[PDB]
Write an enzyme that holds these catalytic residues in place. Structure first.
Site, PDB file in Angstrom:
ATOM      1  N   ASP C  51     -67.315 -26.212   6.763  1.00 16.27           N
ATOM      2  CA  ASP C  51     -68.746 -26.129   7.025  1.00 16.27           C
ATOM      3  C   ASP C  51     -69.511 -26.021   5.714  1.00 16.27           C
ATOM      4  OD1 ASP C  51     -71.381 -24.942   7.425  1.00 16.27           O
ATOM      5  OD2 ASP C  51     -70.769 -24.524   9.467  1.00 16.27           O
ATOM      6  N   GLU C 130     -63.243  -8.462 -19.480  1.00 14.89           N
ATOM      7  CA  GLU C 130     -62.974  -7.038 -19.288  1.00 14.89           C
ATOM      8  C   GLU C 130     -63.753  -6.531 -18.084  1.00 14.89           C
ATOM      9  OE1 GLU C 130     -63.833  -5.043 -22.845  1.00 14.89           O
ATOM     10  OE2 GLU C 130     -63.227  -6.768 -24.083  1.00 14.89           O
ATOM     11  N   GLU C 132     -64.955  -4.161 -15.778  1.00 11.71           N
ATOM     12  CA  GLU C 132     -65.007  -2.745 -15.461  1.00 11.71           C
ATOM     13  C   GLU C 132     -65.540  -2.602 -14.045  1.00 11.71           C
ATOM     14  OE1 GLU C 132     -66.212  -2.098 -20.144  1.00 11.71           O
ATOM     15  OE2 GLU C 132     -67.325  -0.966 -18.627  1.00 11.71           O
ATOM     16  N   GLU C 187     -62.983   4.298 -17.829  1.00 12.31           N
ATOM     17  CA  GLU C 187     -64.154   3.897 -18.590  1.00 12.31           C
ATOM     18  C   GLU C 187     -65.099   5.091 -18.757  1.00 12.31           C
ATOM     19  OE1 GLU C 187     -65.417   0.490 -20.782  1.00 12.31           O
ATOM     20  OE2 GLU C 187     -63.604   1.142 -19.762  1.00 12.31           O
ATOM     21  N   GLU C 194     -61.370   0.192 -16.224  1.00 13.15           N
ATOM     22  CA  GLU C 194     -61.241  -1.094 -16.891  1.00 13.15           C
ATOM     23  C   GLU C 194     -59.773  -1.483 -16.963  1.00 13.15           C
ATOM     24  OE1 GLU C 194     -63.462  -1.635 -20.577  1.00 13.15           O
ATOM     25  OE2 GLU C 194     -61.638  -2.547 -21.406  1.00 13.15           O
ATOM     26  N   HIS C 243     -66.984  -7.791 -20.073  1.00 10.09           N
ATOM     27  CA  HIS C 243     -67.135  -8.423 -21.374  1.00 10.09           C
ATOM     28  C   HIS C 243     -66.557  -9.830 -21.368  1.00 10.09           C
ATOM     29  CE1 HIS C 243     -67.565  -4.313 -23.600  1.00 10.09           C
ATOM     30  NE2 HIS C 243     -68.475  -4.512 -22.667  1.00 10.09           N
ATOM     31  N   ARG C 314     -70.932  -1.903 -30.856  1.00 12.21           N
ATOM     32  CA  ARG C 314     -71.082  -2.090 -29.418  1.00 12.21           C
ATOM     33  C   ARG C 314     -72.533  -2.030 -28.948  1.00 12.21           C
ATOM     34  NH1 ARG C 314     -65.792  -1.367 -27.156  1.00 12.21           N
ATOM     35  NH2 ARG C 314     -64.381  -0.679 -28.828  1.00 12.21           N
ATOM     36  N   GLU C 331     -67.633 -11.600 -28.710  1.00  9.65           N
ATOM     37  CA  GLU C 331     -67.781 -10.819 -27.485  1.00  9.65           C
ATOM     38  C   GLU C 331     -69.258 -10.736 -27.126  1.00  9.65           C
ATOM     39  OE1 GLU C 331     -65.996  -6.937 -27.538  1.00  9.65           O
ATOM     40  OE2 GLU C 331     -67.592  -6.036 -26.341  1.00  9.65           O
ATOM     41  N   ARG C 333     -71.808  -9.147 -24.547  1.00  7.52           N
ATOM     42  CA  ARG C 333     -71.814  -8.010 -23.640  1.00  7.52           C
ATOM     43  C   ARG C 333     -72.954  -8.064 -22.639  1.00  7.52           C
ATOM     44  NH1 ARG C 333     -68.847  -3.805 -26.595  1.00  7.52           N
ATOM     45  NH2 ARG C 333     -70.104  -2.144 -25.636  1.00  7.52           N
TER      46      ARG C 333
HETATM   47  N1  LIG Z   1     -58.339 -14.791 -29.434  1.00  4.24           N
HETATM   48  C1  LIG Z   1     -58.886 -14.363 -28.271  1.00  4.24           C
HETATM   49  N2  LIG Z   1     -59.554 -15.205 -27.454  1.00  4.24           N
HETATM   50  C2  LIG Z   1     -60.096 -14.782 -26.298  1.00  4.24           C
HETATM   51  N3  LIG Z   1     -60.024 -13.512 -25.858  1.00  4.24           N
HETATM   52  C3  LIG Z   1     -59.382 -12.557 -26.576  1.00  4.24           C
HETATM   53  C4  LIG Z   1     -58.765 -12.949 -27.853  1.00  4.24           C
HETATM   54  N4  LIG Z   1     -58.201 -11.844 -28.367  1.00  4.24           N
HETATM   55  C5  LIG Z   1     -58.435 -10.828 -27.496  1.00  4.24           C
HETATM   56  N5  LIG Z   1     -59.142 -11.245 -26.426  1.00  4.24           N
HETATM   57  C6  LIG Z   1     -59.571 -10.402 -25.273  1.00  4.24           C
HETATM   58  O1  LIG Z   1     -59.913  -9.060 -25.647  1.00  4.24           O
HETATM   59  C7  LIG Z   1     -59.709  -8.211 -24.507  1.00  4.24           C
HETATM   60  C8  LIG Z   1     -59.419  -6.758 -24.885  1.00  4.24           C
HETATM   61  O2  LIG Z   1     -60.462  -5.930 -24.367  1.00  4.24           O
HETATM   62  P1  LIG Z   1     -60.752  -4.444 -24.928  1.00  4.24           P
HETATM   63  O3  LIG Z   1     -59.426  -3.825 -25.316  1.00  4.24           O
HETATM   64  O4  LIG Z   1     -61.600  -3.757 -23.888  1.00  4.24           O
HETATM   65  O5  LIG Z   1     -61.622  -4.717 -26.269  1.00  4.24           O
HETATM   66  P2  LIG Z   1     -63.097  -4.105 -26.530  1.00  4.24           P
HETATM   67  O6  LIG Z   1     -62.917  -2.622 -26.242  1.00  4.24           O
HETATM   68  O7  LIG Z   1     -63.532  -4.437 -27.939  1.00  4.24           O
HETATM   69  O8  LIG Z   1     -63.944  -4.833 -25.529  1.00  4.24           O
HETATM   70  C9  LIG Z   1     -58.557  -8.836 -23.736  1.00  4.24           C
HETATM   71  O9  LIG Z   1     -58.823  -8.842 -22.329  1.00  4.24           O
HETATM   72  C10 LIG Z   1     -58.438 -10.252 -24.268  1.00  4.24           C
HETATM   73  O10 LIG Z   1     -58.564 -11.177 -23.189  1.00  4.24           O
HETATM   74  C1  LIG Z   2     -70.045 -22.970  11.876  1.00  8.04           C
HETATM   75  S1  LIG Z   2     -70.076 -23.344  13.659  1.00  8.04           S
HETATM   76  O1  LIG Z   2     -69.973 -24.707  13.112  1.00  8.04           O
HETATM   77  C2  LIG Z   2     -71.266 -22.206  14.478  1.00  8.04           C
HETATM   78  C3  LIG Z   2     -71.888 -22.721  15.803  1.00  8.04           C
HETATM   79  C4  LIG Z   2     -71.897 -21.554  16.813  1.00  8.04           C
HETATM   80  N1  LIG Z   2     -70.672 -20.753  16.672  1.00  8.04           N
HETATM   81  C5  LIG Z   2     -72.036 -22.086  18.243  1.00  8.04           C
HETATM   82  O2  LIG Z   2     -71.433 -23.157  18.560  1.00  8.04           O
HETATM   83  O3  LIG Z   2     -72.754 -21.477  19.127  1.00  8.04           O
HETATM   84  N2  LIG Z   2     -69.142 -24.015  14.687  1.00  8.04           N
HETATM   85  P1  LIG Z   2     -67.701 -24.759  14.132  1.00  8.04           P
HETATM   86  O4  LIG Z   2     -67.299 -24.199  12.787  1.00  8.04           O
HETATM   87  O5  LIG Z   2     -66.597 -24.463  15.124  1.00  8.04           O
HETATM   88  O6  LIG Z   2     -67.932 -26.250  14.002  1.00  8.04           O
HETATM   89  C1  LIG Z   3     -67.064   1.239 -24.290  1.00  7.18           C
HETATM   90  S1  LIG Z   3     -67.074  -0.193 -23.160  1.00  7.18           S
HETATM   91  O1  LIG Z   3     -67.039  -0.891 -24.447  1.00  7.18           O
HETATM   92  C2  LIG Z   3     -68.248   0.108 -21.782  1.00  7.18           C
HETATM   93  C3  LIG Z   3     -69.384  -0.944 -21.763  1.00  7.18           C
HETATM   94  C4  LIG Z   3     -70.618  -0.288 -21.116  1.00  7.18           C
HETATM   95  N1  LIG Z   3     -70.245   0.950 -20.446  1.00  7.18           N
HETATM   96  C5  LIG Z   3     -71.277  -1.224 -20.104  1.00  7.18           C
HETATM   97  O2  LIG Z   3     -70.717  -2.310 -19.785  1.00  7.18           O
HETATM   98  O3  LIG Z   3     -72.388  -0.912 -19.585  1.00  7.18           O
HETATM   99  N2  LIG Z   3     -66.147  -1.393 -22.830  1.00  7.18           N
HETATM  100  P1  LIG Z   3     -64.898  -1.863 -23.905  1.00  7.18           P
HETATM  101  O4  LIG Z   3     -64.423  -0.706 -24.761  1.00  7.18           O
HETATM  102  O5  LIG Z   3     -63.754  -2.395 -23.090  1.00  7.18           O
HETATM  103  O6  LIG Z   3     -65.427  -2.928 -24.832  1.00  7.18           O
END
Ligand SMILES: Nc1ncnc2c1ncn2[C@@H]1O[C@H](COP(=O)(O)OP(=O)(O)O)[C@@H](O)[C@H]1O
Ligand SMILES: C[S@](=O)(CC[C@H](N)C(=O)O)=NP(=O)(O)O
Ligand SMILES: C[S@](=O)(CC[C@H](N)C(=O)O)=NP(=O)(O)O
Ligand SMILES: Nc1ncnc2c1ncn2[C@@H]1O[C@H](COP(=O)(O)OP(=O)(O)O)[C@@H](O)[C@H]1O
Ligand SMILES: Nc1ncnc2c1ncn2[C@@H]1O[C@H](COP(=O)(O)OP(=O)(O)O)[C@@H](O)[C@H]1O
Ligand SMILES: C[S@](=O)(CC[C@H](N)C(=O)O)=NP(=O)(O)O
Ligand SMILES: C[S@](=O)(CC[C@H](N)C(=O)O)=NP(=O)(O)O
Lengths: 442, 442, 442, 223
Positions: C51, C130, C132, C187, C194, C243, C314, C331, C333
């Site tokens: 659908d 990342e 969270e 976190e 996280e 992140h 950060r 990164e 954010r």
């Molecule tokens: N070369 C890279 N390319 C893409 N992502 C990376 C690379 N190196 C590290 N990362 C990402 O960094 C993340 C680590 O997150 P985190 O430890 O929370 O760091 P920070 O606290 O600075 O955000 C991992 O999930 C990883 O995917």
């Molecule tokens: C998404 S619906 O398309 C909803 C129509 C409603 N249930 C009715 O036939 O009254 N029907 P279907 O997925 O079975 O084709």
């Molecule tokens: C210290 S935090 O840095 C938390 C981010 C913040 N609390 C927010 O996303 O709003 N994340 P991370 O250490 O994984 O980079």
């Protein structure tokens, strides 16, 4: 008649402190406004105006403002709280802000259709109403509950009528308000009540009608009861419908009294029946303008369900009271107190008076109990059946264009609009009779 | 086809402890009667009497004795009664004492109008339904409620959907039993789920329907939930429809296929559309027979409001799935899983192939949103509206001759009587909607 | 590569029993549909329709039907349905009824915007997220309350962290669903968690993002705990931000590591920043597409509030982690887990590639605490202030007719549509905070 | 109210989907026993000093609202359908426009503005409306057209062809318009425009930073 000079001596003699400037919107719902006597002399100069857009069914917002010109003969001081500040009220009809009568004012729609019985030569269109109401207990937080005050029958007594001195208290406030009250009695269904007052001319009974509901809905709430005029609040017991007793008058002669014809009835009267009995399918959207009353129009509860008439019988659409003479009248049993008592007379007069210019040869009285005759015999006589719902009852009126015309245009247009809205509102809604019957079973 | 001899010895190979002869009333209520393997012959030899008197749709009490003749091809064991009470199943057709097969047997009527495509060359009448249902929680009492197993939407994921592990244990309850289950998932409205399968022969698809309803009903509360096939239990959410895909077969060819077109749809197919589309307004009282049904038949809820069609489009009455191959089909969506499967196929065939016997021409496919059309802009394209109330759709069935004769003389006579009194209780009772709307204001 | 033959083969090996064909709608909302192994071949044939109109953002009803094309590399068995009905998921793409893809399919939009590096010469565009999330308690009846499971802090130990063996188990279902999990921990705000996983390519990290939430939400509600990725369910605490750690590669050469320029970052690396740094005012309607996330964007909770950058810091909108090599990365954010990863990608790519073919002189590192420089000192560098609300975010996007081009026109025309009706929804509502400060006070 | 059991609020919009409360502002000037808007025998009976007063306020409308709708909540009333002025315009005996002209004149002629709820500071609202409204007579400004139709039923970019723009959407939006207005600022005072623009920004800040239940309802379960 009263003038602007004897209204100063009712504010000053009676020592009122306020004047309530009331009227009725299209749906039959009274709306009023309260001014200090300090402004009495402004209203009587007709210079008082409101918001038209918020009165249901009047005018649109681009031209909201509309005028109010008071009527003077309608003055009645209020006999409840009168030491706090005594109250007065003058009701009237609404004009558009060019000194033109509004077409959405139902009152004026009655006074327009009233001038069509002077060309035909009639001096009063008398009406006697019987608005039957219920009484429900009020809960701890003053919210009306599903319990009724009493479990009483017809014409019952203490201890089995709890609104005994309650109805009494109503009749007294009406007595003080110039009324001339006929009878006070309990009715057939549990919690059903009727209070009878003498007829007045067409627009003064409508006046004394919408006056009546206020005296009961406030005074019953001083006994802790909430009064309602819903037609069949309870499924399975007599709905409460507002019988309309009408008679035409001609220079102190009731034009319906002629003791020669078969039932001591006159010719302008037999003619009047068929005026209604053929257009009755028409106005049973006006005279029964609510989804609920089509639950009262079902057979067995001394309410009419088919279009016929009889002498003394409380089954058909028209009943001929066994008393006659000056008290001669024609009882129409389908109107319920949820009707609009202005649109009713205009819609029934024109319908009726339609049978004086043609008179259309009324049928024979079905002189049985018309409740128990088969579809094989409702057919046999040819008695039209009354509209199943409001859905049907509506399309049956836009087809009777003598009724559409007793409604002006403005009032008709906003009505088929509004009542198809409510009617469509309810048709699409899932209310729980369908959950019980079907949810657990299929 | 199955043998009378390889079923008698089909018990000693799986150790079957009981047998359930079951049939269908006039409404779609799978009946039963349980009996031991003790009696295996006496039922196979069609001397299982019972009382039609108490079953809605059958003979009166002065001639009540009726007989059960099983259709031995319909044989499964339930995968829950395991080694303690291993249950066998058949489905019976109904016959009189004279052993004249019964004049109201709904599975006969379909077995009967199944050879009216025979006399014009068709192998099988294909049907594949997509029946939506709603799922409600329970209580201490183990009884239904007003709250639904999850608040979810189309295709959502656990945790947003919560039948995710219900429907799995449902489908592979039918999968054992012999179903080719296409899809299981969560439909649009919260707690509403769709499980559909591959099409089948007319009697054996609807044979497979009553299986799916029961099986869904049973495995639902094994997981704590209530299985309703109500058409519209809640407001404002999509109804539950038992979608209708069908197709006609002829000598290893889907008679609707047009191998190398730009429509891939034969003019025999194209004639079938007008076959129903013309008679649409006449047999929908059988496609949606309950008073609640018509509250699902409204705009906006992916449900047909108007008699019209279009392609790859789920607004119109008949949807044209753009997947054709051999899986070509015309999909009428105006059914909800309350109608009687063995009779909405009769009353959809007896009309649709009358679009070919009379060879009519289907209207313009309106490939716009049909709901979007102005009140009278669709009055010009001729697409009129489905019937309003069951009261209005009932009249329209009594008058249509085509579908009236693809229904039976004893089935139409004992189906119009019920639905009127089923429609009458609805008209006469008052629902809490009305005190909510009328009580405290009038 | 994974061919259709290995996957037919894969099934009979592990005894998978259902197939889950999932996809992401326009907003981030993972939808899917369940089918037995019995249809697995109707799936791989690309002949399963669904659908279009009841998935948000896709299509209209007038052309409802649409197809589903499986991507076979994503194949993973769902480990938590051991032995009974085993399941296995694949992440589809959408094609119209004409076997051509969907211009509104969010997967094909990422596909489209990826080909823009194939002509500028880049092997891979890595992303490491990342996500969270917060955890809340449940009620007795399985309905998420507002208490959190633990009052812990960043990195705290059991028992100041009730979900210690919640995340532990969260990690394990990922360890068998093909994840290389990087680190697990608590976190800043209490009840925050996280769990990092090592980067994947563009369209595989998105798939492995959406797989992450299905598995954190499901597994946690098997701990009697509700998992959320709201950006700030509580006021006054650290929001949760997912992140974005992206890196570009050229022939096993991370195109950002060239151990010369000021921080061992490359010309393509520094250049890349410039694109987003100016354009960021246009894409935080995509990277923060929800009102609740502008409550996250205030200063003082390790969230970006102005568009600048710095090293190891950060506070600014783009942090470069002091680790480099193949571990060289940038990164952003500004993104929270309440956004569409594919659309975020399609948006930040053309907003970073524009920093390559014009390269627009990326500004100098704002190596202070960006929360502690006044509005005089924001204006000092000229550091743009992030969009104030979602409304201010939308209009600042539709002026970026290069970020609208990372979306397509089907996508953009539907996304501004909904967020306008949604941002309208909250602008009009009257929520408790306003009664509090204004009712008894005015 | 409290003497008879109840609590009285002047909050402009304490519910949803129902008319809000509003301090209509019917104004007129007087000149030597004379109503400066009355033209006893005009066509509109609307002195060309009335019209120039009309323009005066309707020009500066966009920017002095933060003085007449100072609450964040006031802007939860400035939306159509509830007889509340949503767009800068004017007409007669019509309750859709910003400035409504009530039909009765006599000596009591008035032009009625309806964009004030009983939350603004009347001692300062009049100072704003006299200043910037007599700025359309002192400047002999000519008013824009009457739109004598219900304004809510006009298309999204329709009212742009007839030239009628819209009122500020939020307090932030309305505050910028004031800070860029000098006609009402000097008709407002230097200690007042200074203590007032520092005061409602934090009050608008609180609103902006805090998370309402609407966000936990909408986004907690799905997102
Ligand atoms: N070369 C890279 N390319 C893409 N992502 C990376 C690379 N190196 C590290 N990362 C990402 O960094 C993340 C680590 O997150 P985190 O430890 O929370 O760091 P920070 O606290 O600075 O955000 C991992 O999930 C990883 O995917
Ligand atoms: C998404 S619906 O398309 C909803 C129509 C409603 N249930 C009715 O036939 O009254 N029907 P279907 O997925 O079975 O084709
Ligand atoms: C210290 S935090 O840095 C938390 C981010 C913040 N609390 C927010 O996303 O709003 N994340 P991370 O250490 O994984 O980079
Ligand atoms: N001649 C008449 N014209 C108009 N109304 C009349 C006339 N006579 C009686 N009525 C009305 O009939 C009502 C009394 O009704 P009620 O005593 O209940 O009669 P019933 O019980 O026969 O219906 C009074 O309110 C009165 O106004
Ligand atoms: N040739 C055919 N004849 C009858 N029914 C068919 C044919 N091909 C497919 N179908 C039916 O189409 C239905 C598809 O279900 P589903 O995919 O949910 O439909 P939709 O797309 O309308 O929701 C199945 O129930 C199947 O029985
Ligand atoms: C016998 S009754 O007639 C009961 C009235 C009934 N409930 C009805 O109005 O339909 N009323 P009344 O005799 O006072 O006119
Ligand atoms: C009927 S109303 O006309 C409605 C005014 C609107 N509620 C407002 O916000 O000003 N105003 P009024 O009667 O005071 O002139």
């Amino acid at each position: 008649k009263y003038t602007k000079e004897d209204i100063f001596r009712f504010a000053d003699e009676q020592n009122v402190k306020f004047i309530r400037l009331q009227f009725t919107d299209i749906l039959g719902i009274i709306k009023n406004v309260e001014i200090p006597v300090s402004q009495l002399k402004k209203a009587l100069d007709n210079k008082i105006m409101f918001d038209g857009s918020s009165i249901e069914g009047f005018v649109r917002i681009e031209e909201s403002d509309m005028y109010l010109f008071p009527d003077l003969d309608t003055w009645v001081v209020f006999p409840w709280t009168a030491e706090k500040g005594k109250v007065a009220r003058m009701i009237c009809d609404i004009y558009n802000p060019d000194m033109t009568p509004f077409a959405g004012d139902p009152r004026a729609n009655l006074k327009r259709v009233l001038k069509e019985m002077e060309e035909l030569g009639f001096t009063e269109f008398n009406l006697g109403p019987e608005p039957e109401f219920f009484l429900f207990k009020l809960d701890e937080n003053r919210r009306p509950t599903l319990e009724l005050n009493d479990s009483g029958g017809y014409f019952d007594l203490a201890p089995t009528d709890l609104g005994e001195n309650c109805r009494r208290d109503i009749v007294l406030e009406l007595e003080e308000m110039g009324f001339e009250i006929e009878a006070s009695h309990h009715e057939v269904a549990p919690g059903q009540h009727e209070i009878d007052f003498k007829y007045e001319d067409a627009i003064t009974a409508c006046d004394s009608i919408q006056t009546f509901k206020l005296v009961v809905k406030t005074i019953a709430r001083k006994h802790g009861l909430h009064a309602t005029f819903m037609p069949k609040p309870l499924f399975g017991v007599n709905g409460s419908g507002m019988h309309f007793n009408m008679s035409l008058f001609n220079e102190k002669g009731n034009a319906f009294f002629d003791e020669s014809g078969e039932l001591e009835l006159s010719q302008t009267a037999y003619h009047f029946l068929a005026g209604m009995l053929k257009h009755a399918r028409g106005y049973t959207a006006v005279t029964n303008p609510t989804i609920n009353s089509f639950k009262r129009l079902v057979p067995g509860y001394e309410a009419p369900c088919y279009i016929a008439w009889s002498g003394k019988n409380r089954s058909p659409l028209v009943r001929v009271p066994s008393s006659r003479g000056l008290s001669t009248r024609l009882e129409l049993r389908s109107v319920d107190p949820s009707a609009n008592p202005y649109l009713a007379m205009a819609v029934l007069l024109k319908a009726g008076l339609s049978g004086i210019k043609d008179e259309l040869t009324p049928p024979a009285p079905v002189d049985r109990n018309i409740y128990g005759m088969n579809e094989e015999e409702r057919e046999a006589t040819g008695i039209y059946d009354l509209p199943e719902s409001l859905g049907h009852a509506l399309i049956e009126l836009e087809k009777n264009e003598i009724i559409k015309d007793g409604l002006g245009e403005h009032i008709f247009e906003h009505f088929i609009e509004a009542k198809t809205i409510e009617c469509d509102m309810f048709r699409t809604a899932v209310h729980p009779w369908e959950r019980e019957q079907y949810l657990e079973i299929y």
